[PDB]
Amino acid sequence: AQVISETFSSGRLNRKQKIGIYKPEKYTDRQAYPLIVVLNAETLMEPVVSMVRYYEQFGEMPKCIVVGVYEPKQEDVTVVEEVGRPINESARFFEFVSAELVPYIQGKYPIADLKGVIASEEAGFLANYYMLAEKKPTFNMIVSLNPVALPRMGEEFSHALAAGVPNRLFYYMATADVENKVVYDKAIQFERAMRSAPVHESVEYHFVDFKGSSVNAAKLQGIAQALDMCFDIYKPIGGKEFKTQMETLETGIYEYLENKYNTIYKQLGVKKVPILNDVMATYTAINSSQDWESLKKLAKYVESNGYLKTAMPNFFLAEYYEKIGDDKKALKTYQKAYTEPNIDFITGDLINERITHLQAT
Amino acid sequence: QVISETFSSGRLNRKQKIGIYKPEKYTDRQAYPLIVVLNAETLMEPVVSMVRYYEQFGEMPKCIVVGVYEPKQEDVTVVEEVGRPINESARFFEFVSAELVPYIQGKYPIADLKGVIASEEAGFLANYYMLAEKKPTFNMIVSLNPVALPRMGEEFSHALAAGVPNRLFYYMATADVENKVVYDKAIQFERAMRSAPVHESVEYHFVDFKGSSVNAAKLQGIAQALDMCFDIYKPIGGKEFKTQMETLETGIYEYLENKYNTIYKQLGVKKVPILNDVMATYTAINSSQDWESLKKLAKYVESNGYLKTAMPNFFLAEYYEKIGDDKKALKTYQKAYTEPNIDFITGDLINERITHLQAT
Numbered sequence: 001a002q003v004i005s006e007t008f009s010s011g012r013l014n015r016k017q018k019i020g021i022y023k024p025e026k027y028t029d030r031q032a033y034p035l036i037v038v039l040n041a042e043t044l045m046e047p048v049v050s051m052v053r054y055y056e057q058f059g060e061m062p063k064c065i066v067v068g069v070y071e072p073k074q075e076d077v078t079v080v081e082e083v084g085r086p087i088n089e090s091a092r093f094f095e096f097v098s099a100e101l102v103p104y105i106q107g108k109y110p111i112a113d114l115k116g117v118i119a120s121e122e123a124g125f126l127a128n129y130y131m132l133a134e135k136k137p138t139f140n141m142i143v144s145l146n147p148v149a150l151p152r153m154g155e156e157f158s159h160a161l162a163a164g165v166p167n168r169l170f171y172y173m174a175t176a177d178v179e180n181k182v183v184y185d186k187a188i189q190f191e192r193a194m195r196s197a198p199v200h201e202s203v204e205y206h207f208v209d210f211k212g213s214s215v216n217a218a219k220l221q222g223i224a225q226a227l228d229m230c231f232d233i234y235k236p237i238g239g240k241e242f243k244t245q246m247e248t249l250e251t252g253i254y255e256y257l258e259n260k261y262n263t264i265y266k267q268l269g270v271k272k273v274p275i276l277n278d279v280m281a282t283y284t285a286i287n288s289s290q291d292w293e294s295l296k297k298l299a300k301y302v303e304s305n306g307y308l309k310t311a312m313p314n315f316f317l318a319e320y321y322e323k324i325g326d327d328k329k330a331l332k333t334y335q336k337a338y339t340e341p342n343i344d345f346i347t348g349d350l351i352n353e354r355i356t357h358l359q360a361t
Numbered sequence: 362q363v364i365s366e367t368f369s370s371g372r373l374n375r376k377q378k379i380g381i382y383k384p385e386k387y388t389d390r391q392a393y394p395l396i397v398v399l400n401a402e403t404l405m406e407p408v409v410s411m412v413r414y415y416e417q418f419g420e421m422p423k424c425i426v427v428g429v430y431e432p433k434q435e436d437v438t439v440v441e442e443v444g445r446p447i448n449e450s451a452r453f454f455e456f457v458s459a460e461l462v463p464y465i466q467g468k469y470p471i472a473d474l475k476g477v478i479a480s481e482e483a484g485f486l487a488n489y490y491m492l493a494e495k496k497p498t499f500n501m502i503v504s505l506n507p508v509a510l511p512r513m514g515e516e517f518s519h520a521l522a523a524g525v526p527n528r529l530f531y532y533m534a535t536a537d538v539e540n541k542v543v544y545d546k547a548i549q550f551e552r553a554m555r556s557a558p559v560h561e562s563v564e565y566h567f568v569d570f571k572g573s574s575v576n577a578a579k580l581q582g583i584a585q586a587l588d589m590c591f592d593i594y595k596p597i598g599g600k601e602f603k604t605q606m607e608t609l610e611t612g613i614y615e616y617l618e619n620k621y622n623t624i625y626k627q628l629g630v631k632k633v634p635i636l637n638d639v640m641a642t643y644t645a646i647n648s649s650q651d652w653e654s655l656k657k658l659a660k661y662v663e664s665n666g667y668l669k670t671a672m673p674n675f676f677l678a679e680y681y682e683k684i685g686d687d688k689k690a691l692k693t694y695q696k697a698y699t700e701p702n703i704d705f706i707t708g709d710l711i712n713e714r715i716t717h718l719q720a721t
Contacts, residue, residue: 001406043414043417043418046410046413046414047407047410047411047414049410050406050407050409050410050411051407051410051580053406054403054406054407054576054580055576057402057403058403058576060574060576178600179598179599179600179601181600213588214420214588214592214595216414216415216418216420216588217584217585217587217588220411220414220580220581220584221580221581221584221585224577224580224581224584225577225581227577228574228576228577232574235574238539239539240538240539240541241539
């Protein structure tokens with residue numbers, strides 16, 4: 001877990017800005033990574049980096065690149081009550097992230113279509129204004145932790161949420177009331193005004209109120225929750241999910257697996273190689289409902305991604321030919337699978353038993 | 362910086378991979394609380410990052426964190442047939458207690474507060490340090506998503522009722538999403554554990570995360586555990602000031618003193634009183650006009666950390682003005698003029714006090 005510190009020369013800020021960059025363990029440009037920007041990084045950086053590594057080890061998250069901004073000035077992250085939008089110093093910092101920092105990272109690294117931003121306090125409220133971008137969203141993920149807000153600006157963000165985005169917007173806001181009372185009340189007033197209008201379907205909205213909780217402890221839990229829900233589609237298929245969403249399907253079982261990994265690419269901007277757990281879950285569900293059309297499509301699907309060098313694709317296909325009554329193609333296909341390495345319960349011995357049974361008849 | 366090293370264990374009869382976190386700005390001049398992480402292949406970095414986080418906000422003292430990486434299945438697993446650590450599980454249990462912890466105590470000035478963070482099987486194994494009859498090795502136990510034996514619930518319930526010599530902070534968390542078999546056993550175990558009333562020396566917390574994924578819950582568990590266990594270390598807030606302090610007619614100094622005594626008792630560290638806490642105490646003292654607290658506050662700050670500043674004599678000199686003695690007030694103000702300025706207390710202000718006394 002190495003965060004490399006460097007200075008970024010900013011035209012808008014007219015100063016050298018300290019930033020730092022986390023790159024995953026094995027790093028190749030052959031794949032793409034989602035970007036997470038941290039404005040508060042003197043505090044928030046290490047908890048964010050440690051938690052994205054944590055989730056990645058459990059396979060709940062893809063490898064990500066995290067870029068922190070260290071110790072921005074108060075005037076940089078503060079939206080004044082008078083105007084109600086970033087101006088002067090705050091406007092310069094606001095655009096510095098959008099027009100300078102992020103494109104710089106996109107040039108230096110293969111950044112995926114998913115780019116998030118995490119901020120707290122004044123910067124946490126400043127981060128909201130990326131929703132109002134006229135051109136095209138810079139951030140598809142906005143995490144606002146204990147923001148210092150302006151209640152009067154709630155209605156304007158309400159319209160933005162109702163309008164929606166071209167693809168997806170994940171918004172997470174958290175606040176805590178303990179020794180926060182002035183700030184806490186303004187946060188609630190702002191949030192109430194923001195949820196006034198119904199939220200567009202392209203937007204996933206989350207507001208968590210931590211009551212009886214200290215601010216700093218709530219912010220940590222906010223990061224954990226936000227990352228969990230935003231990247232949730234990346235999670236492996238669980239037994240409960242399998243028993244519910246899959247085994248209850250009579251047909252279109254392969255489509256469930258495909259839709260999941262398609263949704264992963266749409267939301268997270270990354271192409272995930274199907275994990276053996278997800279493949280076997282699909283295969284088991286296929287057998288229980290006896291839907292063999294999914295089995296044929298599953299065979300070609302795993303052949304396309306990652307399993308080409310394994311006996312599995314032709315084993316699935318050979319079984320499919322048996323189910324539809326073609327022994328001739330099944331025998332030829334089993335013999336083709338035998339020439340490929342074993343994976344899981346697919347073995348040379350098992351394939352041979354199938355071949356022996358077909359040559360007996 | 363987390364430094365990994367191999368540790369030769371007599372009880373494990375092998376070389377165990379461990380790692381150690383020393384705080385930034387380390388010194389031998391102070392003691393640090395020890396936190397042991399059994400699951401550290403996962404839990405190490407989040408724990409270290411969060412104690413850093415809390416320390417930066419002044420909600421935690423500097424701490425030393427040690428952890429063991431990837432213990433064997435049989436090491437952390439308590440079997441159903443017994444309900445206690447045996448063989449490989451017993452050796453590992455005594456490994457961290459009788460070897461690892463003393464080893465760290467030899468390298469560094471470890472404070473009296475020691476704690477253990479663990480999850481899954483190890484999380485349940487950590488509950489048995491509560492049963493040690495010699496003397497508690499860990500005063501802090503955090504069990505995150507434990508794999509539990511509900512049969513042992515009553516036995517732990519007796520130990521919770523019995524109590525501990527000084528203090529025991531216990532935290533257990535669990536989550537039901539795709540946990541269904543494990544979650545149910547955890548709930549059953551907790552209900553049996555919570556049956557008997559808890560002793561005063563034990564602070565018990567069980568947080569049930571419903572509709573939450575397991576791994577996400579464990580992260581929040583750590584955040585909450587650290588927050589509540591070290592809570593006494595936190596600065597005095599405005600709400601706490603207007604409530605617990607400004608509403609006191611007398612014994613205002615005792616409130617400040619009791620807080621830092623509790624910090625030393627629970628956390629095993631001596632915290633230099635921060636200026637905000639002192640000023641809050643001083644402010645409440647003036648509002649309630651309790652001068653007896655002012656004199657004791659002057660001696661207290663002189664004894665901890667403020668000796669080199671004009672503040673102790675300034676407080677004492679003011680106490681003399683309030684009590685009616687202008688002779689000692691003048692003499693004390695003159696002593697205060699020599700020591701360096703702190704905050705609003707300055708040579709100029711003191712000089713104003715002196716000339717007023719010399720005029721009369």
